[PDB]
Enzyme design. Structure first.
Site, mmCIF file in Angstrom:
data_model
loop_
_atom_site.group_PDB
_atom_site.id
_atom_site.type_symbol
_atom_site.label_atom_id
_atom_site.label_comp_id
_atom_site.label_asym_id
_atom_site.label_seq_id
_atom_site.Cartn_x
_atom_site.Cartn_y
_atom_site.Cartn_z
ATOM 1 N N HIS A 51 -12.283 -0.853 -1.689
ATOM 2 C CA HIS A 51 -12.733 -0.139 -0.462
ATOM 3 C C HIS A 51 -14.065 0.583 -0.724
ATOM 4 O O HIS A 51 -14.981 0.441 0.119
ATOM 5 C CB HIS A 51 -11.623 0.803 0.027
ATOM 6 C CG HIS A 51 -10.483 0.087 0.671
ATOM 7 N ND1 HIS A 51 -9.631 0.705 1.560
ATOM 8 C CD2 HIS A 51 -10.070 -1.196 0.579
ATOM 9 C CE1 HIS A 51 -8.718 -0.159 1.964
ATOM 10 N NE2 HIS A 51 -8.972 -1.340 1.379
ATOM 11 N N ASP A 85 -8.105 6.650 6.222
ATOM 12 C CA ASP A 85 -7.859 5.668 5.135
ATOM 13 C C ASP A 85 -6.602 4.896 5.462
ATOM 14 O O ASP A 85 -6.652 3.650 5.711
ATOM 15 C CB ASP A 85 -7.618 6.414 3.810
ATOM 16 C CG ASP A 85 -7.492 5.571 2.555
ATOM 17 O OD1 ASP A 85 -7.745 4.317 2.636
ATOM 18 O OD2 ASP A 85 -7.173 6.178 1.487
HETATM 19 N N1 GDP Z 1 1.881 -0.850 -5.045
HETATM 20 C C1 GDP Z 1 1.329 -0.575 -3.832
HETATM 21 N N2 GDP Z 1 0.223 -1.266 -3.422
HETATM 22 C C2 GDP Z 1 -0.331 -1.005 -2.199
HETATM 23 C C3 GDP Z 1 0.274 0.040 -1.346
HETATM 24 N N3 GDP Z 1 -0.439 0.105 -0.219
HETATM 25 C C4 GDP Z 1 -1.451 -0.808 -0.336
HETATM 26 N N4 GDP Z 1 -1.383 -1.487 -1.516
HETATM 27 C C5 GDP Z 1 -2.276 -2.592 -1.977
HETATM 28 O O1 GDP Z 1 -3.433 -2.718 -1.132
HETATM 29 C C6 GDP Z 1 -3.276 -3.948 -0.341
HETATM 30 C C7 GDP Z 1 -3.782 -3.690 1.070
HETATM 31 O O2 GDP Z 1 -5.182 -3.548 0.890
HETATM 32 P P1 GDP Z 1 -6.037 -3.072 2.158
HETATM 33 O O3 GDP Z 1 -7.493 -3.415 1.893
HETATM 34 O O4 GDP Z 1 -5.524 -1.670 2.270
HETATM 35 O O5 GDP Z 1 -5.486 -3.966 3.330
HETATM 36 P P2 GDP Z 1 -5.959 -4.053 4.859
HETATM 37 O O6 GDP Z 1 -6.698 -2.773 5.212
HETATM 38 O O7 GDP Z 1 -4.647 -4.258 5.577
HETATM 39 O O8 GDP Z 1 -6.815 -5.316 4.820
HETATM 40 C C8 GDP Z 1 -1.829 -4.455 -0.450
HETATM 41 O O9 GDP Z 1 -1.641 -5.915 -0.298
HETATM 42 C C9 GDP Z 1 -1.525 -3.937 -1.863
HETATM 43 O O10 GDP Z 1 -2.051 -4.866 -2.817
HETATM 44 C C10 GDP Z 1 1.453 0.757 -1.897
HETATM 45 O O11 GDP Z 1 2.027 1.657 -1.259
HETATM 46 N N5 GDP Z 1 1.903 0.402 -3.099
#
Ligand code: GDP
Ligand code: GDP
Lengths: 179, 159, 183
Positions: A51, A85
């Site tokens: 990010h 976020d």
């Molecule tokens: N272990 C863990 N990983 C997380 C968690 N939340 C997000 N992630 C990681 O971050 C990813 C999501 O990334 P992000 O860029 O936030 O996704 P988007 O905004 O939906 O495209 C997930 O597939 C995980 O790999 C959490 O609570 N625990």
């Protein structure tokens, strides 16, 4: 169209919701602030770095791991756009600390409805899988669903992001049925 | 145009239950609740199909509380779910009066590790497809917001 | 371009037992192309063999079948032709095959997304949404959930059209103008 003060963006894990919120912010011409809720294991560190890499010098970063509503109240102004976020990871922080989630959820939706500066809320759908085996995950699933319902009511606009594609569902007429 | 049947689908705590309840209270009809002071209340853990036929009249508006738990029941008793699910969809077309079916999406997460969860995930998906096809209207509820997907022309792509 | 003009690529996304395979099948059978199923499902157990049997039974003799458990991008590049329509069984099960073999998932995901840009004939990708449940317990499940989300983003960007299938009903989300907001 006319300017709004609140957008809710709901999507699954790795749906593109973050990138979508970022682009909506970068199109606004406002002063951009990321309200970071993620606590830094190596899985979180990787997300936070991904990010951060994809954010240029226009962006200010303020941490709010727990005190999210207070932070929004303090930092929001017409001249700025705040992006939350992850509503989900803020809820996760409260859950694991032991907090009763209903009051902070109610307080965040109240704050959303009274915002004096624009905010984009990014949040996960976590309800469209099976019932979780353990009690704490069931309480989290329940609360995240309640939270998104309250935020969707409070917010001017709601978008679902699926496989990186945004669909607006608010504003929009609720369907009417005659039986 | 008046409809005889509405399927409401959403995730856990999606706002779908209160959406279905509120659609009745806007209808002008005799509101009734099926479970698996303007409301009656009836139980049907194992007969649902048979039940709906009996309890539907032109003046009544039934609401099935969860399709999701009725499925669970047959599941537990060790029933072959394909014939019952087929029956309930046939029933949904031929009711003596209108009916709102409330059901969960449970297929949009990872493959569950235990056989029973996998079998329920599978049945719930087949069940929602069969009720969607039989019902006049279908709404997806997401964070308390209803979106109509039926009626409406399904998209067509040419190659 | 009008909506009825031939397209090169369609992504169909849905949950488990959503109707997504039947939607893809219907779109393919409405075309005048030689219909080819690109099968990614391995018969690892009785449950997988049942799903395979249902898919075989659903498809009339118009269909040809080509297995691509691992080498999906290479298979599409070799088998796509202007007179053919290729339907990818499951992107999800192809990724599941890679996950259990041990391959790094990002390179073959990005290769597939680029491949979707320049095939010699039309393709339909059928893929699961796996992101809308709770965070999984184990590391492999978390890595899979993340890679599948990234994969569907890349395929949706690359494909001419994208549909979400929910309780057996398709909704178009691409083409379609993105929402715009002023703040
Ligand atoms: N272990 C863990 N990983 C997380 C968690 N939340 C997000 N992630 C990681 O971050 C990813 C999501 O990334 P992000 O860029 O936030 O996704 P988007 O905004 O939906 O495209 C997930 O597939 C995980 O790999 C959490 O609570 N625990
Ligand atoms: N055990 C197991 N079963 C699966 C897997 N993938 C799919 N299935 C089964 O197959 C069903 C999906 O059938 P499918 O025809 O592909 O569904 P649709 O295309 O979504 O309608 C699921 O509900 C599961 O029962 C898997 O990886 N493991």
């Amino acid at each position: 169209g006319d300017p709004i003060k609140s957008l809710l963006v709901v999507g699954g894990a790795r749906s593109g919701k973050s990138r979508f919120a970022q682009r909506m912010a970068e199109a606004s011409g406002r002063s951009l602030v990321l309200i970071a809720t993620a606590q830094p294991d190596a899985e979180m560190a990787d997300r936070i770095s991904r990010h951060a890499a994809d954010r240029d010098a226009r962006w200010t970063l303020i941490e709010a791991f727990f005190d999210l509503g207070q932070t929004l109240r303090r930092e929001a102004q017409p001249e700025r756009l705040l992006v939350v976020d992850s509503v989900t990871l803020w809820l996760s922080n409260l859950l694991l600390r032991g907090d009763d989630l209903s009051p902070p959820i109610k307080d965040l939706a109240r704050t959303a409805a009274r915002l004096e500066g624009p905010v984009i809320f990014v949040s996960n759908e976590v309800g469209a899988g099976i019932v979780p085996d353990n009690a704490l995950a069931r309480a989290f699933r329940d609360a995240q669903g309640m939270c998104n319902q309250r935020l969707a009511e409070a917010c001017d606009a709601v978008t679902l992001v699926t496989a990186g594609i945004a669909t607006q569902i608010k504003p929009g007429p609720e369907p009417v049925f005659r039986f």
